[PDB]
Structure to design on (755 residues):
RNA sequence: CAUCCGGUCGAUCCUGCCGGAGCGCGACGCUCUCCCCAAGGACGAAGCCAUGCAUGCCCGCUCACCCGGGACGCGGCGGAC
RNA sequence: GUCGCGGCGCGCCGAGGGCCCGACGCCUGGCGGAGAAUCAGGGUUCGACUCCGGAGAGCGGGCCUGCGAGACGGCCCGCACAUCCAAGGACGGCAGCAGGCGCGGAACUUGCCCAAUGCGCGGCGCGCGAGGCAGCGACGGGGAGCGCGCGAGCGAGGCGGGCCCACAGCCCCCGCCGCGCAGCCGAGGGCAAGGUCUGUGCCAGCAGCCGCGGUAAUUCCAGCUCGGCGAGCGUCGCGCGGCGCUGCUGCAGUUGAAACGCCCGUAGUUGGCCCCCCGCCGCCACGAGGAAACGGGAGCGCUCCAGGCAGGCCCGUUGGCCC
């Protein structure tokens, strides 16, 4: 049988219901320039994550307030969202969870965080920098632009001392 | 078909054993002896998982071949020897001895004991039967068979085994009020006093016992093991079967992970 | 069936025009962004226009 | 370029006379020059008194960072290493040489042929 | 209609079971008479050796001579007439060449002007027919 | 985690199917810069099989030209998993 | 008789037994569940395949051994189907693993090894095509690329050294070099993207459907641009969704398809109002009991992610709980 056969796998993205719709295409392209997104598949993965969360809150909210269930899981969902920075830490209500949008999830992507921190000039520049392993999420080198930073980790993010700046000074173009 | 099965698959193995899904495609096949598969846990699992004294099964066999560990005071070389409730797992070379009890979440737990506590182990008589010329015999949960029991002891009445002379020491009979620890099912791992026993003649005597949280748990006589009279008798785990709820355990988990 | 493929064998052959190789990946979508949204210099002539219009073209080269 | 090597959760194992632990080797902007280089550094905390007695295993180096974690098997005595050791681990260290290549297919072919020859 | 009573489930189950058969779609999918009729015999593709070649006049209004090869499937020795897609691609097909034929696309219905033809050639002599048209591979 | 849209007409409103729009999971074509996980002769042939291989271990009982090697057999246990 | 119970078999005696709440027959390109696909709610279809139970080793049978086999990597017989042969005889059984042929639309190496995970046997480890390790492999799932900037960089590679490994290798870590690289389907609609410029002339073709082409083809065949999706994209067969076109929610029956020509009528289904306070039935709630995986779902930064149960001086660190 083998251990591998036992391993789970998942489709983390939702493809559209109509794939040639004019409104969806326009917003997608506007989002694509905004966050330096590689393919619509990355945008799709964002919609999926929001839909899971929205449904989880929806079910807990249909359950009556103070029903054991909302206490155990609703507190957990809010905690998780506040700790990834998707949700404002003041809101802290399950009803607010429903009113989230994919853009806000995309905002916590490191490439957007690097740009607001300014460690790079553009969202394009942020993607190239994170790829070159220049970025550090805090004592840890990050090569993946997708990385979603936790709200606490944002301050820890800095260009790693070993990199293009403050270093050997001789990699790539400098060597020749 | 044909004869017996000498292999156990990892996902078939009991959940309380907490074996890794990707850890292996096979699990230790527990052997027969004093405890059955549903109500046992292999000796290799205590030494490899909780104790971590032996890195691999091979190391556990080497230690066992040299009689490093003694259960019930006897050095046993069975990696798959079944271990269950009140079994005294004493490893003298490491200098540490503990009993094997039940955690609130139902996994078997190693609870440290003093030298007096190490000497004796509790037992539960399943029933008293007549055989071999009519002599009565009492069969403990640990399958220990004792000829000629004192007449007062009845079915389901906890008794204490010397384990040095291996004889009955005393009997705490099962009755209303006496403190018991559930051994199986949803309430497994919970110590409570007996509020009432429902006769339910025909099948399944169902007993209700309540802990000091005012919460009554209803469990049939099969998995009710008396642990002293009103006194808890033998030392009990630190949680003491007080039934922590899911929300409360959520806070405890978060405090533990607060530490880095 | 003696007339099979009558247009294909007698159609004239026009060579593929050599072109600046287009950017690929996120870089293509990034260059598609200037056209679609912020910028708009290439896609407008006093009003919105289609990407393959004969008026957008000739004004943007081809 | 400094290297800091620490032992965490060491285990007393009189049965196999070993000292199981987890080794955190910190080599920021550096490469530890092999496990033996940090074996002496691990020996300092372990206090075994013989670097050879210490066995080092599973030294995963984290992606990019200088936090590498490796299980440690500093046997308390030499007899333990002599006995309770994966023959291959003993071979990796260089404590013993390896046996000359054997087909194993021949070891099974020999079994098949030796049974047929009654 | 809609008999509804707390204890009337059996009547409703029977009605659904009997009535569901009425749709052509349930019958073609589940009666399975079609499986025996299907030349493809429950396969996406079938391998058959070309036994004949012909030109089928396109159904009016559209007029052309669609190019097709009559092929007997190797699997069941069952006749199939298969359209050759692309422009002048019957030149690629040769009699006795051996072809892989796939459904025309309407699940057993003739597609477009071609009359009563339910199959199309996707491969000739181990080489994809589209690739032959696109000049990816030769003969 | 609630949607439709083309085709009966001179036009129109219906019913009604036809065809599209989504996801699978197999085939087929074309193509493929790296890394991770991962299915793989089930699909009306439970058709036929060349070769090699998948079940041994023990040392009870040693008068087999090293030794107390532990041949070989006898025994034992497994081969029913 | 059996391990035993039983028409299980045999005598003996009766006439039962089953059935529109579908017996019996027949067919099944029928292993069943845990589950899976799709999915507002309800639903539909599949369940060979990972776990559990069943069944079989070409086909029927029959046995022996053992505690347990009607065992086939045991035996014996017929039956097809092989091999050898000095011609008397001998002898198999890959629905075990690799590998071969046939067949089909369709499917991988005659590898390497017990180091783990188990098991058999031993007390100082041996056996294992169970299993692990490599190769093959766009079944698929997941993550980063083909630049950014206007000067600095990376990693794809290449080479050493670690790390890893039964031994390699891969990963990862380092020095030293360092050379980014896109397809596949379309642009009349539905359906996002020229009413371009060629050829051609109801031909050749295209087109799921509407249709297009017969000299000014928005549709073919090509350059041209553009659009979708993306290391993938297109086609075919099917499942599900769409389809309230199967309808319990939730269809329709004057005329679109559809009230039996009528009345009686049993089975079936459905029955007004009434008693409070009990007994059975459903009924609702909450238990207990018994498999995990799976699916949820607590916690945990596998660098992110698909993952996995981790981790870290830790609730007796965890691995809860629901189903």
């Amino acid at each position: 049988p083998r251990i591998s056969r036992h391993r789970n796998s998942s489709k983390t993205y939702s493809t559209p219901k109509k794939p040639f719709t004019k409104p969806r295409l326009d917003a997608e392209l506007k989002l694509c320039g905004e966050y330096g997104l590689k393919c619509k598949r990355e945008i799709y993965r964002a919609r999926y994550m929001l839909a899971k969360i929205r449904r989880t809150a929806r079910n807990l909210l249909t359950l009556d307030e103070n029903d054991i269930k909302r206490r155990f899981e609703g507190a957990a969902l809010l905690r998780r969202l506040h700790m990834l920075g998707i949700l404002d830490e003041e809101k802290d209500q399950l009803d607010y969870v429903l009113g989230l949008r994919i853009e806000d999830i995309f905002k916590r992507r490191l490439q957007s965080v690097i740009v607001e921190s300014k460690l790079a000039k553009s969202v394009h520049h942020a993607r190239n920098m994170i790829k070159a392993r220049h970025i550090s999420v805090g004592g840890q080198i990050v090569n993946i632009p997708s990385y979603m930073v936790r709200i606490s980790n944002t301050s820890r993010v800095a260009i790693a001392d070993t990199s293009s700046l403050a270093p050997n000074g001789k990699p790539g173009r400098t060597k020749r | 078909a044909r004869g017996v099965r000498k292999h156990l698959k990892r996902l078939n193995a009991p959940k309380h054993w907490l074996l890794d899904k990707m850890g292996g495609i096979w699990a230790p096949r527990p052997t027969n002896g004093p405890h059955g598969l549903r109500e046992c846990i292999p000796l290799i699992l205590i030494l490899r998982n909780r104790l971590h004294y032996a890195n691999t099964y091979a190391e556990t066999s080497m230690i066992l071949q040299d009689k490093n560990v003694l259960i019930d005071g006897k050095p046993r070389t069975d990696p798959t020897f079944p271990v269950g409730f009140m079994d005294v797992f004493e490893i003298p070379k490491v200098h540490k001895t503990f009993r094997v009890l039940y955690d609130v979440k139902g996994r078997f737990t190693l609870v440290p004991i003093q030298s007096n506590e190490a000497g004796f182990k509790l037992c539960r008589v399943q029933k008293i039967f007549l055989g071999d010329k009519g002599m009565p015999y009492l069969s403990t949960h640990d399958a220990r068979t004792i000829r000629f029991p004192h007449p007062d002891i009845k079915t389901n009445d906890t008794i204490k085994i010397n384990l040095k002379t291996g004889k009955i020491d005393e009997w705490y009979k099962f009755d209303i009020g006496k403190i018991v620890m559930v051994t199986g099912g949803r309430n497994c791992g919970r110590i409570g006093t007996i509020q009432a026993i429902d006769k339910h003649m025909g099948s399944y005597t169902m007993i209700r016992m309540k802990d000091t949280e005012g919460t009554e748990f209803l469990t049939r006589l099969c998995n009710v093991f008396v642990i002293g009279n009103d006194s808890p008798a033998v030392a009990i785990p630190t949680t003491k079967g007080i039934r922590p709820d899911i929300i409360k355990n959520r806070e405890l988990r978060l405090r533990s992970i607060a530490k880095r | 069936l003696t007339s099979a493929g009558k247009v294909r064998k007698c159609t004239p052959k026009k060579e593929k025009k050599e072109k600046p190789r287009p950017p690929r990946g996120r870089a293509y979508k990034r260059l598609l962004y200037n056209k679609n949204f912020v910028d708009d210099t290439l896609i407008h002539n006093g009003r919105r226009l289609g990407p393959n219009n004969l008026l957008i073209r000739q004004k943007l080269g081809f | 370029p400094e290297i800091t090597v620490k032992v965490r959760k060491v285990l007393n194992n009189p049965l196999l006379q070993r000292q199981q632990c987890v080794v955190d080797v910190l080599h920021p902007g550096c490469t530890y020059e092999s496990k033996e280089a940090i074996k002496a550094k691990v020996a300092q905390q372990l206090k075994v008194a013989d670097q050879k007695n210490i066995v080092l295993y599973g030294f995963k180096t984290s992606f990019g960072g200088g936090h590498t974690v490796g299980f440690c098997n500093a046997y308390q005595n030499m007899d333990a290493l002599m006995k309770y050791e994966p023959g291959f681990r003993k071979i990796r260290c260089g404590l013993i040489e390896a046996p000359k290549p054997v087909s194993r297919k021949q070891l099974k072919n020999l079994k098949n042929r030796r049974l047929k020859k009654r | 209609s809609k008999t509804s009573g707390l204890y009337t489930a059996r009547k409703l189950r029977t009605v659904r079971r009997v009535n569901r058969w009425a749709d052509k779609k349930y019958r073609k999918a589940h009666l399975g008479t079609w499986l025996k009729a299907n030349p493809l015999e429950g396969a996406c593709m079938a391998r058959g050796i070309v036994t004949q070649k012909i030109g089928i006049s396109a159904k009016q209004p559209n007029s052309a001579v669609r190019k097709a090869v009559r092929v007997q499937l190797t699997k069941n020795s069952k006749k199939i007439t298969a359209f050759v897609p692309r422009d002048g691609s019957i030149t690629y097909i040769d009699n006795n060449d051996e072809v892989l034929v796939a459904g025309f696309g309407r699940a057993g219905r003739a597609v477009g002007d071609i009359p009563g033809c339910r199959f199309k050639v996707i491969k000739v002599a181990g080489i994809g027919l589209l690739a032959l048209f696109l000049r990816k591979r030769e003969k």
Observations:
- Helices of chain C lie at 6-10, 26-36.
- DSSP finds two helices and no strands in chain C.
- Residues 8 and 49 of chain C are 35 Å apart (CA to CA).
